[PDB]
């Protein structure tokens, strides 16, 4: 929707989530993000071990740990370019970069969150570049 | 934002664009979609010949023609799952499928439009699955 207001809980909660997400990417510490996830949290990811639908917070921790495992000094969010929402969902379109075992990884990414009350109940990631550029 | 209203031109225009985009995918006829694009239209795509930033409507036509060339009976939008917006941008998270030279293509996609007046001024595409599943 075009309109927001301080009472837009969906935006507020999603933004808090995206902050902890940023922190997880940069530092490999994911607990603050995980603590914001519902017990029935699901996430969708495009490829590999974590391809498709994943269920629950244990599996989430496994995912996020795995993400950080090869970025020895983390991933940076270079720009957060577009944030869109509706009653329940927020999408963050961003650019990132980090050394993947010392090799330059760069991408365009869209992460979509659903919000339930003061927490996030689902996540979906989409790839917008080739991992070499953004 | 959480809130909308009939005066939400961004949503209105984007939805019209998405209808013409649906039609282009299903039929390979893109004129109606193209007609809604601004002269300074740009589009971002993740890989291949059209990887990165692409500028202008001539190039847009090439791209959309290219998309349709190998889907002899088109691509169907199986579901439109999430539509989010702000003052200027709308993102459509959807599931699609079609025969790619007789071979089953299925995906999760997010396409993001910017709106300017009664037109669309940019496009960004993100992949959410592996082209085999959604």
Question: Could you explain the architecture of this structure?
Answer:
The structure is a homodimer of 134-residue chains. The first copy, chain A, is an alpha+beta fold and 134 residues long. Chain A has one domain: Nuclear Transport Factor 2, Chain: A (Roll), CATH 3.10.450. The first copy, chain A, is built from three helices and six strands; from the N terminus they run ααββαββββ. Chain A has a six-stranded mixed beta sheet with strand order 2-1-6-5-4-3, with helices on one face. The interface between A and B is large, with 37 and 37 residues. Chains A, B: It comes from Trichormus variabilis (strain ATCC 29413 / PCC 7937) (Anabaena variabilis). Chains A, B: Pfam families: SnoaL_2. Chains A, B: InterPro entries: NTF2-like_dom_sf, SnoaL-like. Chains A, B: This is SnoaL-like domain-containing protein.
């Amino acid at each position: 929707g075009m309109m927001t207001h301080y009472s837009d809980n969906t935006l507020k909660v999603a933004h808090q989530g995206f902050e902890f997400f940023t922190q997880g990417l940069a530092t490999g510490e994911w607990q603050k993000f995980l603590d914001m996830l519902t017990e029935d949290f699901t996430f969708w990811f495009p490829m590999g071990e974590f391809h498709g639908l994943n269920v629950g917070k244990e599996r989430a921790k496994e995912f996020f740990t795995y993400v950080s495992e090869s970025f020895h000094t983390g991933i940076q969010i270079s720009s957060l370019d577009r944030v869109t929402s509706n009653e329940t969902t927020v999408v963050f379109e961003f650019r990132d970069e980090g050394l993947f075992l010392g090799k330059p990884y760069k991408n365009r990414v869209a992460v979509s969150f659903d919000v339930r009350g003061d927490k996030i109940c689902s996540y979906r990631e989409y790839f917008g570049s080739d991992g070499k550029s953004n």
